[model samples]
Target: IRQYSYYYISYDDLKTELEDNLSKNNGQWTQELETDFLESLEIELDKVYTFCKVKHSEVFRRVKEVQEQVQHTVRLLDSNNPPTQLDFEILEEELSDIIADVHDLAKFSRLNYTGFQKIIKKHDKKTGFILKPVFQVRLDSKPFFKENYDELVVKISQLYDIARTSGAGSDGFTVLSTKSLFLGQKLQVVQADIASIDSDAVVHPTNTDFYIGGEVGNTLEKKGGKEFVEAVLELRKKNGPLEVAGAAVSAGHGLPAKFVIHCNSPVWGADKCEELLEKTVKNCLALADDKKLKSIAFPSIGSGRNGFPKQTAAQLILKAISSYFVSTMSSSIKTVYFVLFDSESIGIYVQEMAKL
Candidate 1:
């Protein structure tokens, strides 16, 4: 049943549980008992697949069909007669396919186009690889997804035991955003690596092309890994390039944040430059609001590769954020953090905060 929990488990685990249960009952297992386990397993699997409604997500949806095939095999095995060799072969093949599907889906979290191409280019100069699949899963829904926390394993094991446990909201880790407040909303400004900040989401500044150039993008991609780049590349392919002031979101790769809001805050340009910067800043927050993300961290958008002046960018960021909270009746995002990259960015942001 952990297969149906947050960050779903391998299909092999499901089969293992079934195998252990069948063996535990041995030849004394009854028909009703067999169907009950099969049906519950199928239901829990359904819940897992359905929760991943976000586009391009790799959560497989063929569990019902697999379960039916498996149930039929078990039905025959339960009969008061010796099983034929063909029946055993059919069951074995069906289970193998299920396991293969699990293996394939597992690759979703670990794959990327850039890395695949690097491998092909290394082996044979003539061959190549392409990134066709798009993934929409966040890298770290729980704080220590990569660390193998004992509590995480225990919680996942108990996922099905707790009825109607939703993946979003409160299925995983506990967040402790600043107890501080700003403009009647939760907000904080600090000079720290955004990757190290723990929150519901972290915003990244990028071009319309989703280019991860410079230090800001560098930090994200460095920590986020292949899944991060692959997700960005696929998103640009599907939705086309974003214009200045545009914004989008993807699952946070391996950082503490659950999501990464990609804001297309361009280099300082012509008229409405400040206006666009303000919009871009608010757009990221708006996205966090849309997802009901309680806390979000924002970098100094347009302050780096974009060529926007730091002081001005800081002012615009605070201005838009203030307007966002002041105007909203009941904001979903009660907590916000200005995670500046360095002391200079922090200085400017603090100056702007004082102006507020």
Candidate 2:
């Protein structure tokens, strides 16, 4: 007697395979054989539920969880047995939960999977888990800045035009543009906007009160909508300022990407100390790592309403991110986008980043 082992089958293909197999052996097999086959099939079905329950906990209880579960179920399907309708239902539920978790985590951390992936890869490589650059960007032309808005815009536009028309630095480059009046000998403002940039995740600054009402928050709300606000608020109520280095919570809404890493950048009046600025950036990225974001975009922390000196603030943010990469040993983060709303802010970033 052959003792047949359990075989996996996709839920979709289950019905057809079952019908075909039963039909093929219709007259040849004895009733006892048929009963044994059915029993084996039932056992295999049980395996699906067993594996899912053990691996992912009780994810099937939710509709969303069933959806994500389907992806893996499809992969695990046995060539012979295939999967049944019920299996598909379970899989669909699992997939839903996976997607929901990604969205919720992204909204809370203000980052997506791209951001999460980058941080994770960097950390993994640094710890000697992987041997590779992880991700790479080719620097464009050297930084340049013409004085005044018109001239600066024209020059920057020309660079943009070159980027579009000529494909000069099809890879990537940092541009530095500055006005003579604003230029201090030690600090020349450099503005940069990454072209062809894509990331799985990004961080958003929130007030200590956890409201997205003003400044960056208002812009994010306008673009990402009230849902963003609700998500941040939910986390705020539960976590209350994120005390630890890598602490985070899931957002309530279905955000655009994977996650929204919310870090309390040093507020100007309330927590404007140097230590706070440094800690905020450090903790923010650390939290990004904890959440496993792939790529992240950071604005000039503390330079906005907080009033940290532009140059100083720029240095602090850069140093924190760079140090994170060094300490972690790999660029777990595939891409890091520094978004500067104002020309002055951009200039400060370019100047500081050039030093590195």
Highest lDDT against the true fold, candidate:
1
lDDT of 1 at 113: 22
- What are the per-residue Cα lDDT tens digits for candidate 1 across 36-63? 5445444543443444333123324455
Residue-wise lDDT of candidate 2 within 3-35, one digit each (tens)? 121122323233344445546776243455444
Q: How many residue pairs clash in each candidate?
A: 1, 77
TM-score of each: 0.49, 0.43
The 10 consecutive residues of candidate 2 with the worst lDDT sum are 137-146
lDDT of 2 at 166: 30
Candidate 1 displacement at residue 213 in angstroms: 2.0
Candidate 2 clashes: the total is 77
> lDDT score, residue 256, model 1?
78
Instruction: List candidate 2 segments past 4 Å from native.
Output: 1-198, 242-255, 268-272
Report, for every candidate in turn, its global Cα lDDT versus the true structure: 0.64, 0.52
